[PDB]
From Swiss-Prot, chain A:
Descriptive protein name: Tropomyosin alpha-1 chain
Subunit structure: Homodimer. Heterodimer of an alpha (TPM1, TPM3 or TPM4) and a beta (TPM2) chain. Interacts with HRG (via the HRR domain); the interaction contributes to the antiangiogenic properties of the histidine/proline-rich region (HRR) of HRG. Interacts (via N-terminus) with LMOD2 (via N-terminus) and TMOD1 (via N-terminus).
Segments passing through the bilayer: none
Top-level taxon in the UniProt lineage: Eukaryota
General function of this protein: Binds to actin filaments in muscle and non-muscle cells. Plays a central role, in association with the troponin complex, in the calcium dependent regulation of vertebrate striated muscle contraction. Smooth muscle contraction is regulated by interaction with caldesmon. In non-muscle cells is implicated in stabilizing cytoskeleton actin filaments.
Subcellular location: Cytoplasm, Cytoskeleton
Originating organism: Homo sapiens (Human)
Gene: TPM1
Lineage: Eukaryota, Metazoa, Chordata, Craniata, Vertebrata
Domain-level remarks: The molecule is in a coiled coil structure that is formed by 2 polypeptide chains. The sequence exhibits a prominent seven-residues periodicity.
Entry's family note: Belongs to the tropomyosin family.
Related illness: Cardiomyopathy, familial hypertrophic, 3: A hereditary heart disorder characterized by ventricular hypertrophy, which is usually asymmetric and often involves the interventricular septum. The symptoms include dyspnea, syncope, collapse, palpitations, and chest pain. They can be readily provoked by exercise. The disorder has inter- and intrafamilial variability ranging from benign to malignant forms with high risk of cardiac failure and sudden cardiac death.
UniProt tissue specificity: Detected in primary breast cancer tissues but undetectable in normal breast tissues in Sudanese patients. Isoform 1 is expressed in adult and fetal skeletal muscle and cardiac tissues, with higher expression levels in the cardiac tissues. Isoform 10 is expressed in adult and fetal cardiac tissues, but not in skeletal muscle.
List of residues that carry Phosphoserine: S11, S31
UniProtKB/Swiss-Prot annotation, chains B, C, D:
Gene: ACTA1
Function in brief: Actins are highly conserved proteins that are involved in various types of cell motility and are ubiquitously expressed in all eukaryotic cells.
Catalytic activity from the UniProt record: ATP + H2O = ADP + phosphate + H(+)
Domain of life of the organism encoding this protein: Eukaryota
Name the UniProt record assigns to this protein: Actin, alpha skeletal muscle
Cellular component aspect of the GO annotation: actin filament; actin filament bundle; cell body; cytoplasm; filamentous actin; filopodium; lamellipodium; skeletal muscle myofibril
Species of provenance: Oryctolagus cuniculus
Length: 55, 375, 375, 375
């Protein structure tokens, strides 16, 4: 039980660590979703600067 | 127990000494820089009991010990305790005999020469090492990270050195030595946990608070948003189990402590903050250097592991930086371990084999040799 | 019966409560912070007899009461009992109803926030006080002592705060709070008196040991020289008459008990003493501050009522301090009462009229307001 | 308190400010170019305490203030702090309302024009001065020294200008401007005092190191010989006392700080040093000019107070110079103050009374007028 509880604690430790990493990565995912979109928009703002400059 | 005369590597901080042998990618063990002493009178006969305990012994028997660290913001001031820490490290756990191996130690480039001279002296005079080198922590994180350029920000337990490196060169006029680290963050947390009804003063209590910070705290990408939320709702509290079965919950203190890195005024320090010192190290470099340092904000040591810090530091520099410039943080998993790792890499480089001080050179040159051979 | 609608002042410590009116000389009455309750079965009927006794009532009928203290280590933990102490204090000795009078209460800045919130809440919700303020005991000590600059060493019943103040500003990171106070000195004396053949375990016995300490003990400017004679000759003993006619004497224990303040390990505390905390508070302040704090160590509170303490402290800090520098101590006759004195001074200052929390502000904000407006 | 409407003269540098009245021999008051602000939370009530402190007030109350210098390498960027410095200088110490007196301010000709435009503006738009004249420090240096012809060597706290003047005319193509000055020399000293075990980082500490430099540092005629000697013997060590009783003993750092003027790489500067630039200013002038400039190398401003500087500069220029030619340095006792004196001389010359901008020509033309009327 102590070892199983220890495993629960170690696994919970990992669970929490992964959760923290999950959230960090997910938060990065979200900032990156925002960046991938802002960047796709920049891909267009810059493409537009090229089109405008081309004109 | 090694089958080659590989250099030994030991990263001696105010927190823990990371140690192992050159060529690995990790220390064999981390040896807290602690020497403990009993603070009570023995009653029972035949109990063994020593005058002092070292490293993990000091923490394991801490219930009746007073625990002290020999290192003050990167400089060893208590050499008796470091000989015990080093002896234990080699003798019991690394299973190392320094007499047969070169040894590489690490240090902030900004610390008093007394420390680099004395570390050179003890490995040659107490441990009989055949060779020595003391390395720069900015350099060591950059090697571990695969970089030659960047601002290295330690924000460690002891000191923050804030050192810009370009193409492998130091840019010393742009260095911001800062007297702010995890040891101060911990004291701040003890005072704000006192506000919550949990008074932490004695050694067992100090070690608990350092454990609370390490498991519960974060910086926050945006302090004020987390501040206002954590101060308004229990949904931001996180619990911690105290060793006696009691528990503590922590609210906005969870980030108010780490925040001192960005706001040193929290502990009475007069400082720009880690994001401004990082910024100023970029800003003070030449105009054709600035772009490369903006793109290479390099992490070193611990606290760089706090949630929101890699994103926050990049935002805080961006907010101060000129437009056009692209600002990026290099925050590898080799975090909290990159200085030791850099030592392994450096000790092992073919280009570094002539950088080692040999025993014969040391004996002829005297202790001041570290100034001519290391840095 | 009063000639002004002035503020009320009450230094509610873990020991005693000093109470009176702001603008007066001293407290009108000093009460033990005690609520007493009978521990025996009644046999006679129509004997009056209270469920609980307060302050001086608790001590006057103590022969069959167990006596409890609602305040410990600077914090009220039993708000119901403090409301009872206050109802008695205000209506029976000060002859005032707080409903028409602003009231000032005191704490240490490092006590849990609950202390300031319950002090404020009791007076606003059970007494309907028109206004409240929670004061800093160190500030009150400085006003009473004639200082704006110095280290306040309050050495109280439940806690020693140790705070540097410069030009009216706090240097809060330099507060060296110590878990050693007069209540612990009493318990230490009980144990050493037991070694001498006089065991004390119950409340009546505990109140007497505190009384023995207060009348017989001293600290000594030099405890080693004092011990050389006190441990060698009966001429250094002093007798105390116990309530039951027995006589107890104390020899070198007479100064070894107070010596705990310079040796906290005597009660199991991990500390070097008050002079170490005084010194470190100075050390954590800037170099252009330190000169004024060395010249202004301020003793306040009780337990400073030990002969030899002003000289003991000057020697003990001088011993840690740099040479050339002058180390000086302020230790006025307004000892133990100086916090009350400061309370009256602060409550009545024209510059303090806007520092008060009014009932309207309290009702709109709730009790957490004390944390934001007082300090 | 002045009996005549003479010009006010104020030399406002990045270090100190020299203020007095034209026609006199010396400034009446000297202030640091500092505005101080408290960096701590007030604890006591009715303590007064200013929001900001100026000049000597800023240093006198500095124990809890952060001290800022409004001038960055010779240019004023903080005009809120400079109007405080000027108001204090005029109103409290010179006891004058500028409305009744013309004012002379000073700056190098390569100082961005924005600064002389703003100096003209502060006196006309905030202080309502009836007239203005911004002077060239080199012009003032030669008047004070009794010369019309010579090299002005003026390394200050901010920058070094290096300007040749012949028969009163400037040879501007020969000006060698360097970002090399006392503020950087001080920064180098802080780093090397850290190497010795004395780490100085806070405002109080930064002011101490600057004070150490002024009292202990020198250059020596021969650097290699002074270096070799300091490295060989304690006879070149000098002590300094710090405000709290600490004592620092300084060795070769005593001249390595000043050495940066000849070795700018010590502070990350791309320069060959002040002697190369003093020499080049002579060299860039026509050969029928050079003979008079070589024989009249004139020191002004501070840093010229380092013993061995007049002789090292004369020797280095001589070594770089053609043979036969006589090289001589003028280094009068009116050093560090001679620019103020030159200000007094210029402001009061009858030949200069038509050079003053009135508050009419200024208002009609605007701020840019300084570029046409002064320099
Ligand atoms: N996950 C984390 N959360 C909060 N702080 C951390 C974390 N990891 C490391 N730090 C802090 O950094 C320090 C340990 O990092 P480290 O650089 O390895 O010490 P050292 O210099 O002795 O090697 C401690 O003060 C620790 O509290
Ligand atoms: N002569 C004395 N000897 C020892 N202790 C004393 C003496 N006089 C007063 N004290 C101590 O003063 C304490 C209460 O005073 P006080 O300082 O006003 O508490 P506080 O400041 O925290 O409100 C008690 O513990 C009492 O024993
Ligand atoms: N004894 C000295 N040692 C080193 N430098 C000096 C000495 N005396 C004067 N100087 C420098 O010159 C400054 C004062 O002269 P000055 O040049 O007129 O002010 P500024 O350069 O700011 O215009 C001082 O701040 C100091 O740094």
């Amino acid at each position: 039980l102590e070892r199983a509880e220890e495993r629960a604690e170690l696994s919970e430790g990992k669970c929490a660590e992964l959760e923290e990493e999950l959230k960090t990565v997910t938060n990065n995912l979200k900032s990156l979703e925002a960046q991938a979109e802002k960047y796709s928009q920049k891909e267009d703002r810059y493409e537009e600067e090229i089109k405008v400059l081309s004109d | 127990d090694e089958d080659e005369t590989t250099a030994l590597v030991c990263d001696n901080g105010s927190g823990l000494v990371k140690a192992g042998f050159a060529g690995d990618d990790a220390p064999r063990a981390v040896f807290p820089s602690i020497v403990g002493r009993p603070r009570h009178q023995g009653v029972m006969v035949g109990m063994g009991q020593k005058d002092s305990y070292v490293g993990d012994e000091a923490q394991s028997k801490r219930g009746i010990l007073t625990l002290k660290y020999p290192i003050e913001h990167g400089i060893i001031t208590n050499w008796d305790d470091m000989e015990k820490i080093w002896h234990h490290t080699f003798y019991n756990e690394l299973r190392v005999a320094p007499e047969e191996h070169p040894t590489l130690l690490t240090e902030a480039p900004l610390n008093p020469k007394a420390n680099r001279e004395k570390m050179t002296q003890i490995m040659f005079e107490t441990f009989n090492v055949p060779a020595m080198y003391v390395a720069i922590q900015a350099v060591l994180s950059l090697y571990a990270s695969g970089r030659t350029t960047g601002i290295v920000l330690d924000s460690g337990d002891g000191v923050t050195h804030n050192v810009p490196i370009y193409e492998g060169y130091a840019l010393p006029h742009a260095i911001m030595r800062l007297d702010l680290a995890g040891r101060d963050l911990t004291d701040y947390l003890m005072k704000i946990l006192t506000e919550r009804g949990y008074s932490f003063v004695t050694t067992a209590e100090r070690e608990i608070v350092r454990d609370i910070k390490e498991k519960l705290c974060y910086v926050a990408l945006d302090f004020e948003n987390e501040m206002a939320t954590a101060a308004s709702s229990s949904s931001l509290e996180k619990s911690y189990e105290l060793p006696d079965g009691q528990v503590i919950t922590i609210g906005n203190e969870r980030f108010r402590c780490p925040e001192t890195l960005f706001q040193p005024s929290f502990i009475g320090m007069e400082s720009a903050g880690i994001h401004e010192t990082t910024y100023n190290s970029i800003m003070k470099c030449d105009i054709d250097i600035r772009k490369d340092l903006y793109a290479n904000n390099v992490m070193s040591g611990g606290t760089t592991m706090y949630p929101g810090i890699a994103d926050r530091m990049q935002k805080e520099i961006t907010a101060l930086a000129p437009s056009t410039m692209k600002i990026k943080i290099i925050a590898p998993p080799e975090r909290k371990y990159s200085v030791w790792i850099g030592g392994s890499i450096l000790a092992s480089l073919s280009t570094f084999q002539q950088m080692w001080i040999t025993k014969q050179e040391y004996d002829e040159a005297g202790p001041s040799i570290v100034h001519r051979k290391c840095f």
